[PDB]
From a paper:
In addition to the 2-Allo structure, we also captured crystal structures of full-length mSAMHD1 in two more activation intermediate states: no allosteric nucleotides bound (No-Allo) and one allosteric nucleotide bound to Allo-site 1 only (1-Allo). The No-Allo crystal was obtained without the addition of nucleotides in the crystallization mixture and diffracted to 3.5 Å resolution. The 1-Allo crystal was crystallized with dGTP-α-S in the crystallization mixture and diffracted to 3.4 Å resolution. The No-Allo and 1-Allo mSAMHD1 structures also crystallized as tetramers in different space groups (C2 and P21212) with 4 or 2 copies of mSAMHD1 in the asymmetric unit, respectively. Our No-Allo and 1-Allo structures show that these inactive tetramer intermediates are composed of two relatively rigid dimers with loose tetramer interfaces. Although mSAMHD1 is capable of forming tetramers without nucleotides bound to Allo-site 2, these states are inactive and likely represent activation intermediates of the enzyme. In the absence of nucleotides, mSAMHD1 exists in an equilibrium between stable dimers and inactive tetramers. Starting from the most open No-Allo state, dimer A′ swings progressively toward dimer A via the 1-Allo-state to close the tetramer interface in the 2-Allo state.
Numbering used by the authors: 72 to 307, 316 to 379, 385 to 527, 533 to 548, 559 to 563, 589 to 624
């Protein structure tokens, strides 16, 4: 048989009939629920830590495990990804992957409204998450071998990979729309980032599935390493608790908000380029080969820190990345229609929010906007909520439905145009006024609700503007003219660029 089939009792029987007949040692295995699959991943140190203090017994235990047919690499899992080709994962990663909490990412489109503009962009967060995990693994491995002095362990690598996998665990329906348009609009009081949901959901993930114990059985130390994983996704002498300042560079792998060069961006750049029909000048494998840790000293008392660094002449590669970054941002991300669709879906959700029930832990009812507060409710919240509203028989959603039917039948708000501020920019406070200003600026009455104003912000590494779009809801010609000239006058009045 396989060790995969073996229960802990089976392992106990195997241990007994091989000579380990002592009940406490058997109790170790029963207690820690060490199913067969773990056996080829056990260490001298692990057997020590689990609690066999016999310096010679441990060796022979591992010998017995080695005698068996199935080994370590016999239990890895291989994905076929079109971006990365073949992909090996250590079984723990699969165990994390194979949960409701994670699998839910199959049902959230990466580009959200994008899919309704770019029919190629059907890809979801799931596969992207896989990709990020894999790349994280790759970069950390490369740095590990190239500089063995760095003391980078299996544990670290796995933590980095898990951080990779779970960086997007907490995205809501339609990805950035949810955390970027809907929640801020529906819960202005709460400051919420999909990362927040990511760490909360990871915490939910390990707990719903009792993987703390499994993580221990595979050689992680849950207390430290979960904090490490969480901190990698989230962020903040040395602030982090997960790892010592000596291994600071590890925090630059998965999320590097400092200079915007991380494996997340690598994967989604490549993938979005793949599905949108854009060809990507940036070879990340080149980056990984020429990636090294080395020390930097900046005087603030002088600080000394280990950053990820690239050979100075590999600057051209970054020029390629940032081109692709701009290329995607211009063409796809800040796309005037995609955003319109995001806006309309948000609107529908806002109008659907009061009536739609979603049950969480203990079956407590939650609204779409409040599901983020309960992971077991949020676990059920996916893109499909789009159809659930659309198909609902409840007549209180008829308003919400009609918006969704309009998205389906391409009856969208009319895009009046884009504008740019000549000087200064617009205060985050000043936003909610804007639809009123446009409405009241005169060149038929046009109420403030008839307009949406969409503000968009355009936006280092070490070696060894504002766009305003105005949409009008009223779709008739005369209202369209009126709104157009309203918008022109508003632009002229605030001394903005003459519209597109
Ligand atoms: Mg991501």
């Amino acid at each position: 048989t396989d060790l995969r089939t073996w229960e802990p009792e089976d392992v106990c029987s195997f241990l007994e009939n091989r000579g380990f007949r002592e009940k406490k040692v058997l109790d170790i295995f029963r207690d820690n629920k060490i199913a067969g699959s773990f056996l080829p991943f056990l260490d001298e140190d692990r057997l020590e830590d689990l609690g066999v203090s016999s310096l010679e017994e441990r060796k022979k235990m591992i010998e017995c495990i080695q005698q068996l047919s199935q080994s370590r690499i016999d239990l890895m899992k291989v994905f076929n990804d079109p971006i990365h080709g073949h992909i090996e994962f250590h079984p723990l990663l699969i165990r994390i992957i194979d949960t409701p909490q994670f699998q839910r990412l199959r049902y959230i489109k990466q580009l959200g409204g994008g899919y309704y503009v770019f029919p190629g962009a059907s890809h979801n967060r799931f596969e992207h998450s896989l990709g990020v995990g894999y790349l994280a693994g790759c970069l950390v491995r490369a740095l590990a071998e190239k500089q063995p002095e760095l003391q980078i362990s299996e544990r670290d690598i796995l933590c980095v990979q898990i951080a990779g996998l779970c960086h997007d665990l907490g995205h809501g329906p339609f990805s950035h729309m949810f955390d970027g348009r809907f929640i801020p609009r529906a819960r202005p009081e709460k400051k919420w980032k999909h990362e927040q949901g990511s760490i909360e959901m990871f915490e939910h993930l390990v707990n719903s599935n009792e993987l703390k114990l499994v993580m221990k059985n595979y050689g992680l130390v849950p207390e430290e390493d979960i904090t490490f994983i969480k901190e990698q996704i989230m962020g903040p002498l040395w602030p982090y608790k997960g790892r010592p300042a000596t291994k600071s560079f590890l925090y630059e792998i998965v999320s590097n908000k400092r200079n915007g060069i991380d494996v997340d961006k690598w994967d989604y750049f490549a993938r979005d380029c793949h599905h949108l029909g854009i060809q990507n000048n940036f070879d990340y494998k080149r980056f990984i080969k020429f990636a090294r840790i080395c020390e930097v000293e900046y005087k603030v008392y002088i600080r000394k820190v280990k950053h990820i660094c690239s050979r100075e002449k590999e600057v051209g590669n970054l020029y390629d990345m940032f081109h692709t970054r701009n290329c995607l941002h211009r063409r796809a991300y800040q796309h005037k229609i995609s955003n319109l669709i995001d806006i309309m879906i948000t609107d529908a959700f806002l109008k659907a929010d009061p009536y739609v029930e979603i049950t969480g832990t203990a079956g407590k009812k939650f609204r779409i906007s409040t599901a983020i507060d309960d992971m077991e409710a949020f676990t059920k919240l996916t893109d499909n909520i789009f159809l659930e509203v659309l198909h609902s028989t409840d007549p209180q959603l008829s308003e919400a439905q009609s918006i969704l039917r309009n998205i389906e039948c391409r009856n969208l708000y009319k895009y009046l145009g884009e504008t740019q501020p000549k000087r200064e920019k617009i205060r985050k406070e000043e936003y909610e006024r804007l639809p009123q200003e446009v409405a009241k600026a005169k060149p038929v009455e046009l109420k403030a609700e008839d307009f949406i104003v969409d503000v968009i912000n355009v936006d280092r590494v070490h070696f060894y503007e504002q766009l305003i779009r105005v949409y009008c809801k009223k779709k008739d010609g005369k209202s369209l003219d009126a709104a157009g000239k309203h918008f022109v006058q508003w632009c002229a009045l605030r001394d903005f660029t003459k519209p597109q």
